């Protein structure tokens, strides 16, 4: 159905507000809010949202608390002031996916249309993309397991419409734009290695552990395709790619010629002025 | 080809861009179009009668 | 960027003074819905 | 002793506390006994975008470099005309405190570009800096007539200037007339 | 064998399937007819090229090889990253 | 916008709904928008302001007008209401005059000293903690980055031999278009040499061209890392 | 007047529709809810009444509100599924008592049980210990029965009920032609 | 465009016929100082980025 979605920073900043108004409780469990957007267009667009109280139980995990009246009131007034946005789905700040979440989402699965689930972290220590869009659909399982709600990963992007970019850029005055050049590119070319390093290290360890040491048949079948992807590159000897390396290095030579020639052109005015201005200043000095 | 010049009925002249929705098929000149007060985008065109 | 606010000023008209007065208030001939009579700036003399 | 403490509080998020680290390390390193502080002082001065630590930067610099009045205007010569006016203000305070009580003309001859600027802050700071020098000085040795006249013009120009401009003006004039030339200041 | 000269010949195939050299063309024709293998051999002289295939059920030696190649790839990427970033952080930042 | 437009029962209702929730804050005032006729306040506006300031002595007034406001600056100016009985004494008896220069951002020569009678403004500052800083910075950096971050890099790396090449050809075309004039330049350098009648710098642009040319060199090591491991 | 919250649990099972006892007594106890909520309305109209079932999946039909107008409309569509649930039925109410508006209102929760308890004595005495710990008023009402009326339920109530003075009361209704209304109106908990 | 009375400054006529006085940006060279040309200012800033034939 939906190929990709658009998530604005405003809702995550509303989560920052959720971490703001806490006021030192001593509980700070997962808080379920109500996300709003436009389900009319194929691509999902998030504008703004509100917050609803959500509480659970220590021992029993099947306990979930929502409000129909508050939801209908907030959505009612929001629809009253703005008719260009309606209900879509919900989201939680919990780093882990609870089993009760299917029952929590079941409500909006009944009353509302199909809802999208978003998982974020309470502490922004994650370098990767904090927002993961998960569509709720029923898929046929190959192993023959009974049909249940399955969360499928949907690609997403973080962007703003018009004024939000200005607001962010003004409030920050730190981050820099694309700015094609040396430092902007080389920073990426440096840190990206760590971007892959910490992620892969955080992944393959728990992967290796849970595969051999673990149970609850999450359908490992896709991981054979994972390993297959890892085997899609059987150590190519580059012998066929030698010509490509030759063309690339030829382009490098072109870069060399361009650089040398252009710099040689720039050196003109400098290696003229450095003489003609100095000799004239010196002779007219006294 | 991406951005062209528009002429208002009142007489001032302006310039607009291209929306990701519409294509370059009806973007060709010789056809009266419509504009928006914000960002000067184009929802659709205005066929003459 | 300090001139940027003077760009936000939405430009400036072209003044034409057909007559000067002894009250030190300069009248200016302008395009229709024009003719705004006001004293000039203090750093610039009127008689000039 | 407190080196580790200052180094630990230098990375703090609070701009006020960031300036507090510089103000703390200011009087501690006075006497020009540490060349390490000025490194991160100038570093946080140029790199950081917030004008708070930038205007709070060279005060500690002048405090530790107060020993030699001559070397200061040379290294603050680049901070004479800066990007943001706050740096020019802090630099004006720097030239004010460093050249205070001395006969150094390196600031004095550079006071002329400083006395006139589109920004009122750097102007006021230039008035203070000009107030902290001419005090206790003979007129026959050096031509202070120019800056004295431009200082005496501040009161008649108050109508055509900013409200805070005349404030810093008469405030700068209250420095020379203080104590009737009898009392002065010494670092 | 995930590595070490993937290139093979029809000899092993004809030896295992006890079939002649004449029927291996129809055999691989049927193999390409099913669609489980994308293998296409560009060879001139006698040769057999292989391609992507599905692990399906399970393999133990391919699990050992999985963790092996993965550990090696990981420590290589890590080594290169640290090596480059070592001077890169100092001379550029 | 009017004092009658505000529904008291609906107001108190929503406020109560905020009270039962985790938002126990009283209303500090009200804000609005004044598009296209200016950010100033009309008669009805100052009247309903007078009516709404009966409770709170402060009554912060904020007017946002993005319509004629350039996207270059989002800077906004908060508004205040002076008393009518203070006309005898001084206008603004406020200390800390050092922030008036920061309040000088509305430097417009009309509305300020034009409407200055019985009217004034107040300074504006922000607040940021480590949580908001790190979160928003990481989110924005990620917004300018990719999901796995290794996706769209190799794409351009392999597009250097297709897309960028044409851009390099065009770059050589413009550079040559400069060079043909650069052939005429040494004559002038052999004639006048006094003063510059040409506003064109001819240098920094070509430098930027070199900066765009360095992409190949920077992505070369990238391709090396991709090929290696 | 008296400031307190009212939580009523209805049985959505098919045991209420049996042909021996009242002909779908669900409507009768519905009318009971009506007359007691109207009684509370006459006494203290500012009290709110929530509604939820005893089934496996806990679903709130109406959030606690002083206006029973839409509640009367939400009394329909009982969705006759599931059998019975106890623990999470308690945890979906007593733990949800903190979501009330007025903080000065006392905590009062009742229940209508038309099905045998599937939980052992352990869970019973534990949950009773919990309710006694957090000190919440609980009124046990059982409509219809299969096995013996009160066996472990007596000790359950005794252990659940603290503060003997003016505390909670136990309501036990036997089989009979009379309705449940005037029968549950007998204690002081009603009216 | 109408005329240039001085260096790096000129006047520009509008569509309504009302002449506007706007100082050009330093980046713009003397090529745009041509007496008769089609010039495009901003709808707000009223600055000329480029001219069209
Ligand atoms: Zn209006």
Q: What is the DSSP letter of H32?
A: G
Answer whether C27's CB lies under 8 Å from C17's CB.
Answer: yes
Q: What angle do CA F44, F50, F55 make, to 5 degrees?
A: 140
Q: How far apart are CA D154 and CA B4, in angstroms?
A: 56
Answer for the pair A175, F141: CB distance below 8 angstroms, yes or no. Answer: yes
Q: Fill in the DSSP letter of residue G173.
A: -
Residue G5 pairs in a beta bridge with G107
Largest CA distance in chain C: 39
Could you give the 3-state DSSP secondary structure of residue F62?
strand
Do B11 and H15 count as a contact with CB atoms less than 8 A apart? Answer: yes
The two tokens of residue F80 are 């205040």
A133, β-bridge pairs: A118, A154
Let me know: does D144 contact D137? Beta carbons within 8 Å: yes
The answer, for F125 touching chain D at a CB cutoff of 8 Å, is no
A233 phi/psi in degrees, rounded to 5: -120, 85
Question: What is the distance between the alpha carbons of residues A248 and F216, in angstroms, rounded to a whole number?
Answer: 9
The answer to whether E and C touch (≥3 CB pairs < 8 Å) is: no
Task: Return the DSSP state at C11.
Answer: -
Q: Which residues of C touch H17 (CB under 8 A)?
A: 31
Task: Assess A68–G contact: CB distance below 8 Å, yes or no.
Answer: yes
- Give every CB contact of residue A100 below 8 A, 6+ residues apart in sequence: A56, A61, A62, A63, A64
Q: A13, exposed or middle or buried, with CB in 10 Å at 0-12, 13-18, 19+? A: middle
Q: What number of other Cβ atoms are within 10 A of residue F142's Cβ?
A: 20
Residue C24 to residue C46: CA distance in whole angstroms: 7
How many A from CA of F40 to the centre of ligand 1? 10
Beta-carbon-side half-sphere exposure of residue G9 (alpha carbons within 13 Å) = 30
Report d(CA A185, CA D163) in Å as an integer: 48
F72–C9 CB contact, under 8 Å: no
CA distance A200 to E74: 8
Q: Is F119 helix (H, G, I), strand (E, B) or coil?
A: coil
CA distance F54 to F56: 6
In three-state secondary structure terms, E31 is: helix
Buried b (16+ CB within 10 A) or exposed e, F31-49: eeebeeeebebeeebbebb
> Entry resolution in angstroms?
6.8
Angle (nearest 5°) at CA A280 between A275 and A283:
120
Tokens 């959720």 sit on residue: A18
E59/chain F closest Cα distance in angstroms: 25
**Following DSSP, what letter does each residue of chain D receive, concatenated?**
-THHHHHHHTT-S-HHHHHHHHHHHHHHSTTT--SSHHHHHHHHHHS---HHHHHTHHHHHHHHSTT-TTTHHHHSSTTTS-SSHHHHHHHHHHHHHHSTTS---TTGGGHHHHS--SSHHHHHHHHHHHHTTSSS--TTTS--HHHHHHHHTTTTSTTTS-HHHHHHHHHHHHHHTGGGGS-----
The whole-angstrom separation of Cα F105 and Cα A240 is 64
**Chain C, chain H: beta-carbon pairs less than 8 Å apart:** 31
Distance F34 CA to ligand 1 centre (A): 6
Task: Map G122-171 to HEC letters.
Answer: HHHHHHHHHHHHHCCEEEEEECCCCCCCCCHHHHHHHHHCCCCCCCCCCE
Handedness of CA A70, A72, A73, A78 (dihedral sign): positive
Q: What is the distance between the alpha carbons of residues D75 and H19, in angstroms, rounded to a whole number?
A: 50
C-alpha–C-alpha distance, residues A147 and D73, integer Å: 79
Cβ contacts of F165 within 8 Å, gap of 6 or more: A251
d(CA F117, CA F84): 11
The distance of Cα G101 from the centroid of its chain, to the nearest Å, equals 21
Tell if the CB–CB gap between F72 and C4 is shorter than 8 Å. Answer: yes
User: Do the chains contact at H17 and C31, CB–CB below 8 Å?
Assistant: yes
Per-residue tokens: C43 = 């750093």
Question: Largest alpha-carbon pair distance within chain B?
Answer: 28
Find tokens 């649990």 and name the residue: G9
Q: Under DSSP, is residue A102 helix (H, G, I), strand (E, B) or coil? A: helix
CB contact under 8 A, H29 and F70: no
A7 Ramachandran zone, left/alpha/beta (phi>0; psi -120 to 50): beta
Two structure tokens written together for E56: 């399906």
Tokens standing for E86? 């070592």
> Chain-centre distance of CA E48, in angstroms?
13
Question: Do the Cβ atoms of A35 and A11 come closer than 8 Å?
Answer: yes
Tell whether E59 is within 8 A of chain F (Cβ): no
Alpha-carbon Rg for chain C, nearest whole angstrom, is 13
Contact D82, D46 (CB under 8 A): no
Dist. CA H18–CA H22, nearest whole Å: 13
Q: What is the CA radius of gyration of chain F?
A: 30
For residue F107, list chain C residues with Cβ-Cβ distance below 8 A.
Answer: 5
Binding residues of F: 32, 34, 45
Task: Give the residue from A11, A9, A6, A15 showing the smallest Cα distance to A123.
Answer: A15
Q: Compute the distance between CA of residue G11 and CA of residue G83 in angstroms, rounded to an integer.
A: 9
φ/ψ (deg, to 5) at F110: -110, -70
Give partners of F (≥3 CB pairs < 8 A). Answer: A, C, D, E, H
Instruction: Tell if the CB–CB gap between A252 and F165 is shorter than 8 Å.
Output: no
Using the mean position of ligand 1's atoms as its centre, give its distance from the Cα of residue G16 in Å. 65
Nearest to D133 by CA among D97, D81, D89: D97
**Separation between Cα atoms, residue D161 and residue E21, nearest integer Å:** 103
What DSSP designation does F72 have? T
Tell me which residues of chain F have a C-beta less than 8 Å from any C-beta of chain H: 68, 70, 199-200
**Residues F92, G37: Cα–Cα separation, whole Å:** 60
Please report where in the chains the tokens 């302008």 appear, as a residue.
C30
Residue A163 is classified by DSSP as H
Q: Which residues of H touch F196 (CB under 8 A)?
A: none
Q: Is A30 helix (H, G, I), strand (E, B) or coil?
A: coil
Q: DSSP states of G65-126 as a string? A: ES--HHHHHHTS----------HHHHHTTTTGGGG-S-SSSEEEEEEEE-S---S-HHHHHH
Q: What is the dihedral of CA F28, F29, F34, F37, to 10 degrees?
A: -110
β-partners of residue A35 are A89
Q: Residue E46: how many CB atoms within 10 A of its CB?
A: 10
**Do A190 and E84 count as a contact with CB atoms less than 8 A apart?**
yes
CA torsion E8-E11-E17-E20 (nearest 10°) is 130
Q: What is the rounded CA–CA span in Å between residue G144 and residue D126?
A: 94
Q: Determine the distance separating the centroid of ligand 1 and the alpha carbon of F71, expressed in angstroms.
A: 22
Q: Quote the crossing angle between the two packed helices G152-160 and G121-134, to the nearest 10°.
A: 20
Q: Are G37 and G75 in contact (CB under 8 A)?
A: no
Asked if F28 and F15 count as a contact pair (C-beta separation under 8 A), the reply is: no
What does the block give as tokens for F93?
Answer: 């008896």
- Chain C contact residues (CB < 8 Å to F): 4-5, 8-9
Indicate the DSSP class of residue F122. Answer: E
CB neighbour list of residue D159: distance below 8 Å, 6 or more residues apart: none
D176: left (phi over 0), alpha (psi -120 to 50) or beta: alpha
3-state secondary structure of A7: strand
Among F101, F130, F133, the residue with its CB nearest the CB of D120 is F101
DSSP assignments along A38-100, one per residue: E-SSSSEEE---B-------SS-SS-----HHHHHHHHHHHHHH-SS-EEEEEEE--SS--TT
How far does the centroid of ligand 1 lie from the alpha carbon of residue F68, in Å?
Answer: 14
Give first-to-last CA distance, chain D, whole Å: 25
Contacts within 8 Å (CB) and 24+ apart, G125-130 = G125/G155, G125/G156, G125/G159, G127/G86, G127/G87, G127/G90, G128/G156, G128/G159, G128/G160, G129/G159, G130/G94
Angle of the F204-228 helix axis to the A182-212 helix axis, nearest 10: 20
Whether E89 and chain A come into contact, CB under 8 Å, resolves to: yes
Question: Exposed/middle/buried for A140, CB within 10 Å: 0-12, 13-18, 19+?
Answer: exposed
Q: What is the Cα–Cα distance from A132 to A129, expressed in whole angstroms?
A: 7
Distance F54 CA to ligand 1 centre (A): 24
| Spatial contact of E52 and A232, defined as CB atoms under 8 Å apart | yes
Annotated binding site of F for Zn(2+): 32, 34, 45
> Which positions ≥6 away from D161 have C-beta within 8 Å?
D120, D154, D169
Question: If we measure between CA atoms, which residue out of G168, G156, G7 comes closest to residue G92?
Answer: G7
> 3-class SS at G31?
helix
SS3 F79: strand
Query: Residue F77: phi, psi to the nearest 5?
Result: -115, 120
Radius of gyration of chain B (CA): 10
Q: Cβ of C36 under 8 Å from any chain H Cβ?
A: no
């Amino acid at each position: 159905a939906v190929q990709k979605v658009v998530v604005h920073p405003l809702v995550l900043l509303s989560v920052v507000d959720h971490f703001n108004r806490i006021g030192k409780v001593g509980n700070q469990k997962r808080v379920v809010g109500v996300l709003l957007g436009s389900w009319q267009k194929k691509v999902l667009d998030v504008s703004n949202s509100f917050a609803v109280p959500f509480d659970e139980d220590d021992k029993d995990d099947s306990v979930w608390f929502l409000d129909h009246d508050y939801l209908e009131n907030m959505y009612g007034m929001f629809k009253k002031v703005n008719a260009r946005e309606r209900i879509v789905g919900w989201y939680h700040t919990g780093p882990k996916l609870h089993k009760n979440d299917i029952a929590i989402n079941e409500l909006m699965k009944r009353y509302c249309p199909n809802s999208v689930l978003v998982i974020i972290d309470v502490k922004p220590k994650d370098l990767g993309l904090p927002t993961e869009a998960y569509i709720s659909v029923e898929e046929v399982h190959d192993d023959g397991t009974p049909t249940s709600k399955t969360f499928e990963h949907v690609t997403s992007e973080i962007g703003a419409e018009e004024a939000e970019e200005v607001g962010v850029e003004h409030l920050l005055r730190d981050i820099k734009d694309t700015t094609v050049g040396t430092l902007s590119q080389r920073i990426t070319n440096q840190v990206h290695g760590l971007k892959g390093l910490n992620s892969k290290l955080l992944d393959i360890r728990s992967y290796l552990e849970k595969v051999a040491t673990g149970k609850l048949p999450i359908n490992h079948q896709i991981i054979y395709q994972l390993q297959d992807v890892f085997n899609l590159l059987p150590d190519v000897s580059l012998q066929e790619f030698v010509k490509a390396f030759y063309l690339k290095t030829n382009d490098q030579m072109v870069v060399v010629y361009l650089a040398s020639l252009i710099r040689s052109v720039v050196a003109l005015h400098n290696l003229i002025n450095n003489k003609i201005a100095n000799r004239d200043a010196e002779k007219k000095e006294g | 080809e991406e951005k062209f010049i528009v002429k208002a009925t009142n007489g001032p002249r302006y310039v607009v861009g291209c929306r990701r929705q519409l294509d370059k098929s009806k973007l060709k000149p010789g056809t009266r179009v419509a504009l928006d007060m914000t960002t000067l985008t184009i929802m659709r065109y205005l066929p003459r009668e | 960027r300090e001139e940027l606010q003077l760009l936000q000023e939405q430009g400036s008209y072209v003044g034409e003074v057909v007559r000067a007065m002894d009250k030190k208030k300069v009248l200016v001939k302008v395009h229709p819905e024009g003719k705004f009579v006001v004293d000039v700036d203090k750093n610039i003399d009127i008689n000039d | 002793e407190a080196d580790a403490l200052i180094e630990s509080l230098c990375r703090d998020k609070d701009p006020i506390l960031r300036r507090s680290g510089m103000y703390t390390v200011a009087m501690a390193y006075c006497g020009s006994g540490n060349n390490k502080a000025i490194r991160r002082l100038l570093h946080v001065a140029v790199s950081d975008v917030n004008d708070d630590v930038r205007r709070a930067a060279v005060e500690s610099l002048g405090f530790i470099l107060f020993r030699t009045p001559e070397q200061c205007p040379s290294v603050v010569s680049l901070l004479s005309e800066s990007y943001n006016p706050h740096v020019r203000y802090g630099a004006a305070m720097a030239l004010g405190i460093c050249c205070a009580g001395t006969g150094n003309k390196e600031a004095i001859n550079l006071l002329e570009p400083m006395t006139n600027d589109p920004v009122n802050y750097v102007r006021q700071g230039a008035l203070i800096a000009s107030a902290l020098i001419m005090i206790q000085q003979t007129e026959i040795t050096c031509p202070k007539v120019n800056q004295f006249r431009q200082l005496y013009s501040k009161v008649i120009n108050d109508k055509h200037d900013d409200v805070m401009a005349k404030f810093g003006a008469i405030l700068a004039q209250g420095i020379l007339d203080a104590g009737g030339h009898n009392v002065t200041i010494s670092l | 064998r995930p590595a070490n000269h993937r290139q093979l010949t029809f000899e092993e195939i004809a030896k295992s399937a006890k079939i002649t050299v004449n029927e291996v063309e129809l055999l691989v024709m049927k193999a390409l007819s099913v669609g489980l293998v994308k293998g296409s051999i560009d060879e001139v002289d006698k040769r057999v090229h292989m391609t992507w295939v599905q692990p399906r059920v399970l393999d133990l030696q391919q699990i050992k090889g999985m963790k092996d190649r993965l550990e090696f790839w990981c420590t290589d990427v890590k080594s290169m990253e640290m090596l480059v970033e070592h001077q890169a952080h100092d001379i550029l930042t | 916008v009017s004092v009658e437009a505000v529904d008291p029962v609906f107001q108190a209702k929503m406020l109560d709904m905020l009270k039962q929730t985790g938002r126990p804050e009283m209303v500090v005032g009200w804000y609005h928008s004044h598009p296209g006729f200016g950010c100033w306040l009309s008669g009805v506006d100052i009247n309903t302001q007078q009516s709404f300031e009966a409770l709170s002595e402060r009554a912060v007034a904020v007017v946002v007008d993005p319509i004629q406001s350039v996207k270059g600056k989002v800077v906004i100016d908060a508004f205040r209401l002076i008393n009518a009985n203070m006309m005898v004494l001084g206008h603004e008896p406020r200390q800390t005059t050092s922030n008036l220069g920061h309040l000088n951002k509305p430097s417009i020569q009309a509305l300020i000293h034009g409407l200055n009678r019985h009217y004034y403004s107040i300074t504006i500052n922000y607040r940021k903690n480590e949580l908001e800083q790190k979160m928003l910075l990481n989110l924005h950096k990620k917004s300018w980055m990719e999901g796995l971050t290794l996706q769209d890099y190799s794409e351009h790396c392999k597009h250097n031999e297709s897309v960028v090449k044409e851009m390099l050809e065009l770059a050589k075309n413009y550079n040559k278009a400069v060079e043909e004039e650069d052939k005429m330049t040494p004559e002038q350098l052999a004639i006048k040499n006094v003063g510059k009648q040409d506003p064109k710098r001819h240098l920094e642009e070509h430098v930027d061209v070199l900066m765009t040319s360095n992409i190949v060199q920077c992505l070369a090591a990238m391709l090396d890392t991709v090929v290696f491991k | 007047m008296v400031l307190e919250s009212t939580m009523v649990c209805v049985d959505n099972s098919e045991y209420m529709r049996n042909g021996d006892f009242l002909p779908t007594r669900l409507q009768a106890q519905q009318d009971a809810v009506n007359i007691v909520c109207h009684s509370k309305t006459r006494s203290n109209p500012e009290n709110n009444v929530g509604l939820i079932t005893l089934a496996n999946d806990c679903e709130v039909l109406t959030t606690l509100t002083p206006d029973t107008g839409r509640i009367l409309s939400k009394l329909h569509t009982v969705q006759p599924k599931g059998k019975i649930t106890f623990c999470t039925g308690i945890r979906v109410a007593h733990l949800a008592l903190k979501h009330r508006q007025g903080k000065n209102h006392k905590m009062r929760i009742i229940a209508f049980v038309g099905s045998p308890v599937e939980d052992n004595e352990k869970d019973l005495v534990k949950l009773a210990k919990r309710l006694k710990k957090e000190k919440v008023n609980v009124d046990i009402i059982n409509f219809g029965e299969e096995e013996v009326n009160t066996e472990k339920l007596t000790a359950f109530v005794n252990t659940l009920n603290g503060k003997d003075g003016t505390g909670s009361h136990l309501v036990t209704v036997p089989p009979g032609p009379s309705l449940a209304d005037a029968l549950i109106s007998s204690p002081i908990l009603a009216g | 465009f109408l005329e240039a009375v001085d260096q790096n400054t000129a006047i520009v006529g509008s569509t309504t016929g009302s002449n506007y006085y706007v100082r050009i940006l330093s980046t713009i060279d003397r090529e745009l100082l041509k007496p008769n040309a089609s010039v495009a200012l901003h709808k707000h800033s009223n600055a000329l980025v480029d001219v069209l034939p």
